Amino acid sequence: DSLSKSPENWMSKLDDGKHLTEINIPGSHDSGSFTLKDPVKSVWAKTQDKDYLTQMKSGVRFFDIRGRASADNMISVHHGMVYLHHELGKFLDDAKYYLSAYPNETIVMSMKKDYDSDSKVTKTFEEIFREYYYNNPQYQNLFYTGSNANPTLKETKGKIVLFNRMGGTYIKSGYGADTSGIQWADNATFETKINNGSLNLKVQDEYKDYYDKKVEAVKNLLAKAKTDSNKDNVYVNFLSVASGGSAFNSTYYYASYINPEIAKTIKANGKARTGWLIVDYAGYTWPGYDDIVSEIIDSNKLEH
């Protein structure tokens, strides 16, 4: 049966000799925003309706955690200025729970500063994450701490791999974990070397695009991935787009079009390499339409 038939443990069915970069991985954009209930706010600030555990059950393996330092020992999960009602510990604990339940999966956790620190804060965002989370004995063994820039599934399964969107860091394991960090171009499709030249990161993150331009930018990077068997190359492709347009169109509304359009394209490509595709409303189904998370999972080729 289809891998998308067992989303809760799909990675367990792959050759663990694969480099994570080579795996087609569904991600959720602003993963933590499922806590939002305020309907006026949710139009533009809510990007998911499944909680973290349910997103994992649904096969999501890449988490977009954007944060704000709200005390010298605390990072709160945020969508820009909007507080998402929990701290990073909650994500970590859920991840840790899911990984012991499904220990042949790995999670890639992207970490970004999304808003200015609370005025009492005396430490940088990167220092707080490094000291109060990554290095914290409480989360001992949860993070990938290997020295490989291009780790395999074997060496990462059971753990969270950092995907560093903080800037330069003194953390030494994970994507962009060095004193340069990742050069991220605003609202752009771009390409930049990371991990001291070891990896070429190719990103589509045109989050302010109107609809047609967004779909075209998702497909342009999709088409590139399909031609590229290089493991030293990493694709991150965000289908998520910012709210606005003809009425005051929600992030959901756009996801209801983009997700099925890309799901279908991938399905028609069969087993082509896709890269890591980051979506809004991961796991949200619409009768009659292909499901993006499911098609990303199924696009992985089992050759072993």
Curated annotation (Swiss-Prot):
Pfam families: PI-PLC-X. Cleaves glycosylphosphatidylinositol (GPI) and phosphatidylinositol (PI) anchors but not PI phosphates. Potential virulence factor. SUPFAM superfamilies: PLC-like phosphodiesterases. PANTHER family: PTHR13593, SI:DKEY-266F7.9 (PTHR13593:SF113). The keyword Lipid metabolism applies. Transmembrane segments: none annotated. The active site is at H29, H79. It catalyses: a 1,2-diacyl-sn-glycero-3-phospho-(1D-myo-inositol) = 1D-myo-inositol 1,2-cyclic phosphate + a 1,2-diacyl-sn-glycerol. InterPro entries: PI-PLC_domain (IPR051057), PLC-like_Pdiesterase_TIM-brl (IPR017946), PLipase_C_PInositol-sp_X_dom (IPR000909). It comes from Staphylococcus aureus (strain Newman). GO terms for cellular component: extracellular region. Its EC number is 4.6.1.13. Residues 16-165 form the PI-PLC X-box domain. Keywords: Lipid degradation, Lipid metabolism, Lyase, Secreted, Signal, Virulence. GO terms for biological process: lipid catabolic process. It comes from the Bacteria. It is found in: Secreted. This is 1-phosphatidylinositol phosphodiesterase. GO terms for molecular function: phosphatidylinositol diacylglycerol-lyase activity; phosphoric diester hydrolase activity. The keyword Lipid metabolism applies.
